[PDB]
Design a protein around this ligand. Structure first.
Ligand SMILES: [Cl-]
Ligand SMILES: [Cl-]
Ligand SMILES: [Zn+2]
Ligand SMILES: [Zn+2]
Ligand SMILES: [Zn+2]
Ligand SMILES: [Zn+2]
Lengths: 228, 228
């Protein structure tokens, strides 16, 4: 079931938790879907990942404030690629506090992308702490290590049993890990393992480029990551 | 009009000149087409580019020897990416002399690809000379400079008015230059210009990822390359 608003497709994964999907024909080979989340916190929403473009990101922001009546107050992006950070400028124009891994902010300019305004502090165990943890709660943010990119992070909602693997996690029937141009192939398997252990009980596994699934998406991804 | 043989699609562009198209779902976003050529030289064919895989390349080789009755005697590859060099092992297994730009041979191992057995000697003007020019005639091979990759080369057939731009050239209605992960963005425009001037009279412009077209494909590609 899907609500289509402008260029955006919204699906409810759980109460207060929506998925947004937008498309871009990145390389002329056909439109590519990209998935993020909208997480309701009281009278507002947390945005996980932008759409591909400013204009698509603006449509997400308007949907949250005008249809959900839960305007976006903070956003976190899962690494410095265009499907996850392409609309950063629209967020900053709306004066929305934005958050990323410190390495995503270093890498974004060379990628043609705008850095977030805040660095997430991750503790020595890979969990967010400090201002990021407090402001983005109930979301739990976890850095699993290098995989799809060196800066990729993951976000979880343990109470609801939902964990979002970003672009690191691929579908349970994947034949490949998608775009490895900036991947960390040596660490990929272990970082999948860390993520699986960071959210050991979540049964709903969401990811950037295919719809939500069960934990087999982790199993297939690790299998693929192990034969790199 | 298209002949489908196994996984391969063959189109005749001119007498003695065929196009081969094969598909691979490279990143899980849908199958991607890749185009090469089969050029009849007397009782044999010259192969321009492999298919995505050994198995697809073997089907091209069998088609040439068994249906065309013009077995492949030499092959040239237009740079070190999988759509152009993925089936190098099948060529060498068939004992087919293979040829590439010297930089494609240096780059191929890190890409997971097998180097060709011969380096093409390009003269100071970017045209092939020596053994490559003699053995691959009537094909004219031209190095335009860095663009889609630093090693990309182009092949022409002036008498037939056909010029093949590889992956450097994109379609007349392209919105982007496809996969720029290894591109040379500073030199891209000038190398498109060099190619356009290397084959100034060809009216049929073939390329890797869309069907043959007129010279507007050059015009649109350069326009895109100029705004990088
Ligand atoms: Cl969990
Ligand atoms: Cl010409
Ligand atoms: Zn990515
Ligand atoms: Zn992605
Ligand atoms: Zn290429
Ligand atoms: Zn290509």
């Amino acid at each position: 079931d899907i609500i289509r608003f402008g260029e955006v497709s919204f699906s409810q994964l759980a109460e207060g938790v929506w998925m947004h999907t937008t498309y871009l024909d990145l390389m002329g080979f056909g439109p590519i879907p990209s998935n993020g989340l909208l997480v309701v916190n009281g009278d507002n929403t947390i945005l996980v990942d932008t759409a591909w473009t400013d204009e698509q990101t603006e449509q997400i922001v308007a949907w949250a404030s005008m249809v959900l009546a839960k305007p976006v107050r903070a956003a976190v992006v899962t690494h410095a690629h265009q499907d996850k950070m392409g609309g950063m400028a629209a967020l900053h124009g709306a004066n929305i506090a934005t958050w990323a891994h410190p390495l995503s902010n270093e890498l974004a300019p060379e990628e043609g992308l705008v850095p977030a305004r805040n660095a997430i502090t991750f503790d020595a165990n890979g969990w967010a702490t400090g201002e990021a943890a407090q402001s983005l709660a109930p979301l739990r943010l976890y850095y699993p290590g290098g995989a799809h990119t060196r800066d990729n992070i993951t976000v979880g909602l343990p109470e609801l049993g939902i964990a979002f693997g970003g672009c690191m996690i691929k579908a349970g029937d994947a034949s490949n890990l998608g775009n490895l141009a900036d991947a960390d192939t040596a660490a990929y398997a272990q970082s999948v393992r860390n993520f699986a252990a960071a959210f050991p009980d979540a049964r709903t596994i969401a990811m950037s480029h295919s719809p939500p699934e069960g934990r087999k998406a982790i199993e297939r991804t690790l299998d693929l990551a192990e034969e790199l």
